[PDB]
Amino acid sequence: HDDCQVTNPSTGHLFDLSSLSGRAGFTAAYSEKGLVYMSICGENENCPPGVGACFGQTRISVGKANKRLRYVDQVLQLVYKDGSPCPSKSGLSYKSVISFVCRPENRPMLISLDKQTCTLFFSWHTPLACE
Ligand SMILES: [Br-]
Ligand SMILES: [Br-]
Ligand SMILES: [Br-]
Ligand SMILES: [Br-]
Secondary structure, eight states: OOSEEEEETTTTTTOOOOOGGGGOOOEEEETTTEEEEOOOOOOTTTSTTBBSSEEEETBBOOOOHHHHHHHHHEEEEEEOOOOOOOTTTTBBOEEEEEEEEOOOOOEEEEEEEEEETTEEEEEEEEEGGOO
């Protein structure tokens, strides 16, 4: 239903990330000194309009925001696609994959940047991802 909510279809458990939404959003550490700004289920006020995540140093987009929350194998996931053109001979764009995993007891982390696909992979351990 693409409103920052999703159910586990096997159990009907309703997951909801609306409590993390807001333009102020969050940041994740990037490299030595940089960061990435990110808003959940909406654009981030530090990024260009419509952009849900962007590099701190440049405000260059690594994904357009959306509310299409998905459930797969106990993980909740947002995928912000259509980022800026990345350094790529074949014309790829940056995208951000944001994975919420259960923590029964709340900052995103960048765990990987796959240069092959220009995809930034983030993880966020949160009680919001538990059932
Ligand atoms: Br940066
Ligand atoms: Br949105
Ligand atoms: Br894309
Ligand atoms: Br992790």
